[PDB]
């Protein structure tokens with residue numbers, strides 16, 4: 001794939017990840033061909049560790065709104081995210097920026113595509129994943 | 137920046153990160169302009185949570201080699217990674233694939249650049265960060 005990075009900041013992040021999984025100072029950062037990195041740490045003594053370092057996602061709660069006093073009928077289960085992402089990218093090419101199942105019940109799903117133009121396209125979909133609305 | 141993704145797989149990863157920080161099924165995935173995502177989860181009851189989701193790096197130990205029976209004189213401290221990454225990219229443009237301070241003592245530092253050509257350039261540097269060697 002596109003193995004490697006041009007970012008000192010990323011390499012430093014990868015050194016830092018490894019630095020907290022084992023003792024010793026960093027003596028090698030190496031891109032494996034899957035997408036992961038191997039970092040070698042090395043103690044004053046000469047003890048070598050090898051640390052795998054992967055892209056992770058960390059999730060922290062930001063807000064909260066207790067029960068108004070209805071759950072959701074539909075949801076962004078894995079099926080549903082994959083449908084919307086095709087449907088949306090078919091209708092307009094670019095980066096997906098928003099998916100929601102909030103909607104207005106006859107258009108239950110929404111996606112926002114961002115485009116080279118830096119022009120946002122708010123797309124509206126039927127329960128059956130057909131385009132029913134655009135806003136460019 | 138390049139806000140968004142064309143990857144259902146990434147959105148599903150982001151939904152999954154959030155799914156494990158709070159209860160409820162996912163009803164919104166939204167890219168914030170820093171680089172993070174907000175996921176809204178929603179319980180059967182109607183309780184909304186918002187979850188921040190960031191790029192993280194996770195580090196797991198892979199191997200180990202106890203003391204042969206010398207630590208490292210030099211190391212890839214943050215200073216040193218930033219020097220090598222410029223020095224290397226100056227000498228040859230592309231993605232950095234390896235940094236090491238193993239070397240042969242008169243060339244204490246090494247970098248590997250990967251290039252559009254898919255041609256690897258193994259570069260060799262003095263303690264003073266000058267190029268002393270290439271291998272194309």
Ligand SMILES: [U]
Pocket residue numbers: 038050
């Ligand atoms: U390795």
Ligand SMILES: [U]
Pocket residue numbers: 055056146191
């Ligand atoms: U990621």
Ligand SMILES: [U]
Pocket residue numbers: 063064065184185186
């Ligand atoms: U909320």
Ligand SMILES: [U]
Pocket residue numbers: 098099100164165166
């Ligand atoms: U949204």
Ligand SMILES: [U]
Pocket residue numbers: 174186
């Ligand atoms: U938000």
Ligand SMILES: [U]
Pocket residue numbers: 010055191192
């Ligand atoms: U990253």
Ligand SMILES: [U]
Pocket residue numbers: 048049050199200201
């Ligand atoms: U090792």
Ligand SMILES: [U]
Pocket residue numbers: 028029030234235236
């Ligand atoms: U290396």
Ligand SMILES: [Zn+2]
Pocket residue numbers: 063064065
């Ligand atoms: Zn609130």
Ligand SMILES: [Zn+2]
Pocket residue numbers: 078152
């Ligand atoms: Zn899943």
Ligand SMILES: [Zn+2]
Pocket residue numbers: 077078079080
């Ligand atoms: Zn489903």
Ligand SMILES: [Zn+2]
Pocket residue numbers: 102103104105107108109110124125
């Ligand atoms: Zn709608």
Ligand SMILES: [Zn+2]
Pocket residue numbers: 110122123124133135
């Ligand atoms: Zn809309």
Ligand SMILES: [Zn+2]
Pocket residue numbers: 199200201
């Ligand atoms: Zn071993």
Ligand SMILES: [Zn+2]
Pocket residue numbers: 016214
């Ligand atoms: Zn640091």
Ligand SMILES: [Zn+2]
Pocket residue numbers: 213214215216
């Ligand atoms: Zn230093």
